[PDB]
Amino acid sequence: TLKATVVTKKADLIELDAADNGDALAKLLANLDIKDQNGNPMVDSAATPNTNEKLQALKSVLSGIVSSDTSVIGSVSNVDNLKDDASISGLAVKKAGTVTLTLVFNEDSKIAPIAITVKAPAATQDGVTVTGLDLVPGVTGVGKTKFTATDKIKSGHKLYYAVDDSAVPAPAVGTTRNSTKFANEITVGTTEVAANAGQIITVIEVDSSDRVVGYKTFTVEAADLSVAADKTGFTATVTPTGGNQVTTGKTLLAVSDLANGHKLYAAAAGSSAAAAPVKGIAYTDTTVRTTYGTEVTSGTVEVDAQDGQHISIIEVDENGKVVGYKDYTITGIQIGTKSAS
Ligand SMILES: [Ca+2]
Numbered sequence: 239t240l241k242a243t244v245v246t247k248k249a250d251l252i253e254l255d256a257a258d259n260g261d262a263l264a265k266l267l268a269n270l271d272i273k274d275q276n277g278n279p280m281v282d283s284a285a286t287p288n289t290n291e292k293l294q295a296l297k298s299v300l301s302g303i304v305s306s307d308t309s310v311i312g313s314v315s316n317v318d319n320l321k322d323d324a325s326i327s328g329l330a331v332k333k334a335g336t337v338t339l340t341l342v343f344n345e346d347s348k349i350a351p352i353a354i355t356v357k358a359p360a361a362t363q364d365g366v367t368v369t370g371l372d373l374v375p376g377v378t379g380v381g382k383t384k385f386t387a388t389d390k391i392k393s394g395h396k397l398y399y400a401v402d403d404s405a406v407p408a409p410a411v412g413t414t415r416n417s418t419k420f421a422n423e424i425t426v427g428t429t430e431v432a433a434n435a436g437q438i439i440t441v442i443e444v445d446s447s448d449r450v451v452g453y454k455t456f457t458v459e460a461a462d463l464s465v466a467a468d469k470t471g472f473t474a475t476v477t478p479t480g481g482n483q484v485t486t487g488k489t490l491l492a493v494s495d496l497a498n499g500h501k502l503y504a505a506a507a508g509s510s511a512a513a514a515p516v517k518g519i520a521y522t523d524t525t526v527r528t529t530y531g532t533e534v535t536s537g538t539v540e541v542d543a544q545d546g547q548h549i550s551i552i553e554v555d556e557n558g559k560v561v562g563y564k565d566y567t568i569t570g571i572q573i574g575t576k577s578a579s
Pocket residue numbers: 281282283284285286287288289290291
């Protein structure tokens with residue numbers, strides 16, 4: 239009954255945010271003024287909740303919307319794709335960037351084309367709610383890095399990472415998470431990444447509705463990556479001991495001065511050394527506790543030994559964490575000879 243007669247833009251530019259939910263139509267509408275035959279404003283009245291007057295008014299006079307870059311915001315050729323079912327859509331944001339959306343009207347309306355520049359910003363560091371997000375060496379394996387933070391995330395928000403040789407481009411704020419690109423959810427102080435030094439860990443923060451709000455990149459340095467347990471963390475001196483004092487085919491692992499609350503655990507004698515656990519792993523870890531199943535802390539423990547075989551020993555601290563590692567090749571001299579059992 240009322241026909242849209244006058245359409246004018248307010249500003250030449252509109253910039254999107256997270257609240258815009260990665261779709262420009264709501265902000266494009268807010269940037270347009272529509273007047274009818276009477277010169278009266280054409281406004282979405284809340285008394286008619288499931289029919290938007292303003293959008294419908296625009297759609298009745300609009301022949302299309304051209305984008306300057308179809309990869310940033312897709313061009314609208316069929317006008318009925320603009321809708322207000324549940325929410326206002328869709329000048330859908332595909333990628334972060336800046337476009338000139340040019341609105342073309344029908345011949346009847348006689349309204350000349352209106353160009354509105356739309357900026358869809360990339361997600362940034364100040365959009366990240368977790369303060370002090372940083373990389374530390376891993377404790378689950380060797381060559382691993384771990385996420386740490388000082389303060390918690392905002393309630394409802396989540397973190398996701400990507401690991402690559404190059405930084406993954408910052409997505410537009412408000413766009414729904416790229417499942418493919420950012421597939422690895424971060425539990426802070428728990429989750430670990432296998433990475434090489436020099437690689438980039440690209441982290442995005444999403445909201446409750448899986449939409450990109452934050453973005454931070456870390457360059458993985460050798461300092462941020464985990465290494466095997468060293469002789470550096472090994473304080474005790476262990477002397478394999480044989481002769482007539484020790485049982486035949488067994489070596490006495492005589493222990494000298496470990497630090498007050500330290501413990502020592504030996505792996506069973508085998509043809510080559512046992513795998514050195516990552517510095518910081520709990521002894522209670524299944525592979526660690528099964529490989530290094532014999533506690534040799536007392537200095538009085540004697541274990542099975544053959545000539546060529548290796549005995550690897552780990553030094554665990556007061557807390558229950560692996561600190562030191564050293565591998566011992568056994569000799570016939572340090573294998574026992576005393577009467578059996
Ligand atoms: Ca309405």
